[PDB]
Design a protein around this motif. Sequence first.
Motif, short mmCIF file in Angstrom:
data_model
loop_
_atom_site.label_atom_id
_atom_site.label_comp_id
_atom_site.label_asym_id
_atom_site.label_seq_id
_atom_site.Cartn_x
_atom_site.Cartn_y
_atom_site.Cartn_z
N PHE A 223 44.41 34.53 34.14
CA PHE A 223 43.70 35.34 33.56
C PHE A 223 42.77 36.18 34.52
N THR A 224 42.34 37.33 33.86
CA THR A 224 41.45 38.36 34.47
C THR A 224 40.24 38.58 33.58
OG1 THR A 224 41.31 40.49 35.75
CG2 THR A 224 42.31 40.44 33.69
N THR A 225 39.34 39.56 34.09
CA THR A 225 38.18 39.51 33.49
C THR A 225 37.89 41.13 33.71
OG1 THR A 225 36.16 38.73 32.67
CG2 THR A 225 36.38 39.16 35.16
N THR A 226 36.44 41.72 33.28
CA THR A 226 35.98 42.89 33.56
C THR A 226 34.66 42.50 34.23
OG1 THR A 226 34.79 42.63 31.30
CG2 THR A 226 36.81 43.82 31.41
N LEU A 227 34.06 43.61 34.78
CA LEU A 227 32.74 43.54 35.37
C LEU A 227 31.62 42.93 34.33
CD1 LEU A 227 31.63 45.64 38.17
CD2 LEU A 227 29.98 45.22 36.31
N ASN A 228 31.91 43.47 33.28
CA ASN A 228 30.61 43.22 32.42
C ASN A 228 30.60 41.72 31.84
OD1 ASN A 228 31.78 43.49 29.49
ND2 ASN A 228 32.40 45.29 30.77
N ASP A 229 31.85 41.47 31.59
CA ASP A 229 32.11 40.09 31.16
C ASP A 229 31.91 39.09 32.15
OD1 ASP A 229 33.38 37.71 29.22
OD2 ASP A 229 34.68 37.75 31.13
N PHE A 230 32.32 39.30 33.49
CA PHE A 230 31.90 38.40 34.35
C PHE A 230 30.31 38.27 34.62
CE2 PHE A 230 30.41 37.51 38.67
CZ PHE A 230 31.03 36.46 39.11
N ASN A 231 29.68 39.39 34.56
CA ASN A 231 28.10 39.51 34.66
C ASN A 231 27.59 38.62 33.48
OD1 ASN A 231 28.19 40.64 37.21
ND2 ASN A 231 27.72 42.61 36.28
N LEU A 232 28.24 38.78 32.16
CA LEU A 232 27.58 37.64 31.29
C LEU A 232 27.79 36.31 31.57
CD1 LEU A 232 26.42 38.60 28.62
CD2 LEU A 232 28.63 38.85 27.90
N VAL A 233 28.79 36.03 32.19
CA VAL A 233 28.87 34.52 32.84
C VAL A 233 27.96 34.38 33.92
CG1 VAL A 233 30.46 32.84 33.91
CG2 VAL A 233 31.34 34.45 31.95
N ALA A 234 27.85 35.08 34.83
CA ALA A 234 26.81 35.01 35.88
C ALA A 234 25.61 34.67 35.76
CB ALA A 234 27.28 36.15 36.86
N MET A 235 25.22 35.51 34.58
CA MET A 235 23.95 35.33 34.10
C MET A 235 23.61 34.10 33.62
SD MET A 235 21.56 37.74 31.24
CE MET A 235 23.11 38.30 30.86
N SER A 254 40.59 41.77 49.44
CA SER A 254 41.46 41.76 48.42
C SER A 254 42.78 42.12 48.66
CB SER A 254 40.89 42.75 47.43
OG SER A 254 41.62 42.94 46.11
N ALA A 255 42.98 43.19 49.63
CA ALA A 255 44.29 43.77 50.08
C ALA A 255 44.78 42.44 50.90
CB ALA A 255 44.01 44.97 51.14
N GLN A 256 44.56 42.07 51.88
CA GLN A 256 44.94 40.83 52.81
C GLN A 256 45.80 39.84 51.88
N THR A 257 44.95 39.44 50.62
CA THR A 257 45.43 38.60 49.98
C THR A 257 46.28 39.08 48.48
OG1 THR A 257 43.42 38.59 48.53
CG2 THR A 257 43.76 36.69 50.06
N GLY A 258 46.35 40.58 48.53
CA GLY A 258 46.85 40.98 47.37
C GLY A 258 46.34 40.44 46.03
N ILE A 259 44.97 40.10 45.83
CA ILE A 259 44.61 39.70 44.87
C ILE A 259 43.36 40.54 44.34
CG2 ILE A 259 42.87 37.78 43.71
CD1 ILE A 259 44.63 35.63 44.95
N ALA A 260 43.31 40.92 43.01
CA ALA A 260 42.33 41.80 42.42
C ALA A 260 40.86 41.19 42.36
CB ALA A 260 42.70 42.17 41.13
N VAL A 261 39.76 41.75 43.09
CA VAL A 261 38.44 41.25 42.91
C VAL A 261 38.34 40.79 41.40
CG1 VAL A 261 36.00 41.72 43.10
CG2 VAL A 261 37.81 43.03 44.51
N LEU A 262 38.85 41.48 40.61
CA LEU A 262 38.33 41.06 39.03
C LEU A 262 39.29 39.90 38.78
CD1 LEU A 262 37.58 44.22 36.94
CD2 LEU A 262 36.14 42.75 38.13
N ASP A 263 40.32 39.69 39.24
CA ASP A 263 41.20 38.34 39.18
C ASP A 263 40.44 36.91 39.73
OD1 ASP A 263 42.89 40.22 37.95
OD2 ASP A 263 44.77 39.37 39.00
N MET A 264 39.74 37.54 40.91
CA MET A 264 38.97 36.40 41.51
C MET A 264 37.84 36.08 40.61
SD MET A 264 39.54 34.49 44.15
CE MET A 264 40.37 35.46 45.19
N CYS A 265 37.13 37.05 40.11
CA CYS A 265 36.14 36.91 39.29
C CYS A 265 36.50 36.04 37.91
CB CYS A 265 35.53 38.33 38.75
SG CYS A 265 34.54 39.03 40.08
N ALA A 266 37.71 36.14 37.33
CA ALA A 266 38.32 35.27 36.35
C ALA A 266 38.41 34.15 36.96
CB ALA A 266 39.43 35.92 35.75
N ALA A 267 39.05 33.67 37.97
CA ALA A 267 38.96 32.23 38.64
C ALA A 267 37.61 31.73 38.59
CB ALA A 267 39.63 32.50 39.94
#
Lengths: 296, 296
Positions: A223-235, A254-267
Motif C-alpha cells: 500500500f501507499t498513501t498521500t501526504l494529507n492522509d498520512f497527516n490525518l493518521v499522524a494527528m 529514498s533513492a538508495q532504497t528505491g522506496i517512495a517516501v509516501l510508500d514508507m509513510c503507508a508502512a
Amino acid sequence: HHSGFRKMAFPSGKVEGCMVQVTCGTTTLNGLWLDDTVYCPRHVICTAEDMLNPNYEDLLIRKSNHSFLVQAGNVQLRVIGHSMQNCLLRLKVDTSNPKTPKYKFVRIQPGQTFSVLACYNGSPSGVYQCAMRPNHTIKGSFLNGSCGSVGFNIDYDCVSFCYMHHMELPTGVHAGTDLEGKFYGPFVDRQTAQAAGTDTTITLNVLAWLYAAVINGDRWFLFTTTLNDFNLVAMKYNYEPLTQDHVDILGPLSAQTGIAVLDMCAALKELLQNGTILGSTILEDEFTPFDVVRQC
Amino acid sequence: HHSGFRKMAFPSGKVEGCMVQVTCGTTTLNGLWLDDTVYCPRHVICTAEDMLNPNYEDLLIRKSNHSFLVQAGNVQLRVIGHSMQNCLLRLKVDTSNPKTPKYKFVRIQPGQTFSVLACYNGSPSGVYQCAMRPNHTIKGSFLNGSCGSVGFNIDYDCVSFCYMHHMELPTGVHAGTDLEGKFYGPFVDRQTAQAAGTDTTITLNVLAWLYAAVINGDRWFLFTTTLNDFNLVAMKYNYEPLTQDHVDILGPLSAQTGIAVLDMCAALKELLQNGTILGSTILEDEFTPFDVVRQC
Ligand SMILES: *[C@H](O)[C@H](C[C@@H]1CCNC1=O)NC(=O)[C@H](CC(C)C)NC(=O)OCc1ccccc1
Ligand SMILES: *[C@H](O)[C@H](C[C@@H]1CCNC1=O)NC(=O)[C@H](CC(C)C)NC(=O)OCc1ccccc1
C-alpha cells in the motif's frame, strides 16, 4: 542479521579539554572554558533554599569575582570578571584555555540530535547521543552535579555547542539552554513544578530510521498513501505532520532504497494503526536522516 | 517516568590522541600509536584476493619498513621496525607519541563491556558501548575501513585497551583481538565463512538491568525460586546459568532495592516463560552490574 546500526556519539576529546569545575559556596557544577571565558549555569549561586524560588539578580549582588572557585584539574583559574548572561554566568578568567577548539554556538531546532558529555565535579564521565524533542525537552541521563554538562556536534575541525544542562522536570526529562544562556522551550531555572507540552514523535526521524531497517535487510513492515492522509493518521497518533520539505530531506535515503517516501509513510500508517524493527519493539525517533547516512 | 538510564561510552579523548592511519599498498586501516609503537591488524598487508586465504608469513616477507605509510594527522611517522605479533603488526616508529596516556592491555572476559572508538582513515568518527558476548563476538557498528578501531575502558587516569577490530561474520556480528593480537574466541583473520557458537544471553547483566528498572520506578514484572530451578529455566531459554559468584556480584544492587537476587530470578523466570521494561520490549544484557551502579 545484526545490522550494527545504533546510537553513536561524536568523539568527545575536543570538549573534554574545555570542562572545568565551578564552585560557589557549597554548590558545585561544571563550567565550559573557552578562550578566557568560563560559562556555567547561574544557579551555581543558589543555596538549597534559593532554588525553589530564586531572585537571581539579588543573589548575584552578594557575589564577587573571588566567590567563584574555578578548577581546571590542578590549576585554579583567577576570576577577573563576572556577569549574568540570561540563565548563565559569564566568568572572565586570567588564562585563555590552550585546549580551546575551533567552535561556534548554535541554537538547534527540535528534531535535531547532538552528543552529551556528562560531567561531574568538572570531570567528564560518559558520552551519549540525544535529540531536542518537539516539546523542547531532551531525554537525557543526568544526576545531581551534572549541570553545566554540554551538548555538541562536531563538523570536521569545529565544535558546535548547542546545549548546557540546567534541570530535570517531574516526568524525568531534562531542560536547559543554548550557550547564549537562553532556555529551549518555555522553561525557567526554578525548582517548581513545570509541565512540558505533550511530546510529539519526530516523524522525519522515524521515517529515516525505517529506511535504515530497509538498508539493513528488514522489510516485514512494508500500500501507499498521500501526504494529507498520512497527516490525518499522524494527528491521531501524536506524530508531527509531514511537509514537502521533509520529503525532500528524505530524498537521498529514498533513492538508495528505491522506496517512495509516501510508500514508507503507508508502512508507518499500518504500524500505527496495527502495532520488531532493528531490535526495538517500537519506533526510534532520535535518528536524523543525517545520522542514518553518516553511518552508512 | 523517563529514567534516563542508557548506554553510555567513556569519554574518548585519551584514545583519540592515539589513532593513526596505516596504509600498505592499496589497503588502509587504523593503527594505535603508543609510545614508539604502532599496532594494527596484520591484514593491512593483504590485497583483495589475499584475504580469502592469506599466507601472512609469506605476504610479510615481501614487505619492508618503507612499505608502511603511517600518518598522524599531517605528520608521517618513519617506520624503523616491523614484526608480526599474532594477528597484529607491531610497527616501531622513530617518534614516541606525546599524547600517549597511562594505559594497559587487558583481555576482557565474556559479559564485560567496553567503549569502541570507531575510526576511518585514522580519524575518530564516533563512540559507543559494546559487550564481549558469551560466544566471543561483539555486536558492533563497523564498516569498511574501520579495522584497527579499538575498544577500551577508563579507570581514573588509565586506559585499559581490550579490543582491536578485524572482521565481520556472516551474521553481521564482529570478531577481533586483544592488543596482544590474540583473537577472542575461535575466529581467524581469513575471509571465509566462520560460525560463532550460538549466543547465550548474559544473565548477570539482565538481572542488573532488571534492577535498574526497579531503581528507576518500574516493577510490573515482579513468587521466588531457587538457583537450580532458575538454571533449569535458563538452559531452556539459552541464558547463562547463574552461580553464587554472580549472586554475590549482585549483592550491592540487591541491597539498594531491598530485593532478593532469587526473587529477581523468579521475575525473570516468568518473563521468559510468559513474555515494557526501561523502554525495550526485550531484556537488555549489555549492562554490567558495574555499569548500573556507576550510573546511579
Ligand atoms: C544541576 O546539576 C541539577 C541537575 C538535576 C538534578 C538531578 N537531575 C538533574 O538533571 N539541577 C537542579 O538540581 C535544578 C536547579 C534549579 C535552580 C533549576 N533543580 C531540579 O532539577 O529540580 C528537579 C529535580 C531535582 C533532583 C532530582 C530530580 C529532579
Ligand atoms: C577491516 O576494516 C574490515 C572490517 C569489516 C568490513 C565490513 N565490516 C567489518 O567489520 N575487515 C575485513 O574486511 C575482513 C578482513 C579479513 C582478512 C579477515 N573481512 C571481512 O570482514 O569479511 C566479511 C565482510 C566483509 C565486508 C562486508 C561484510 C562482511
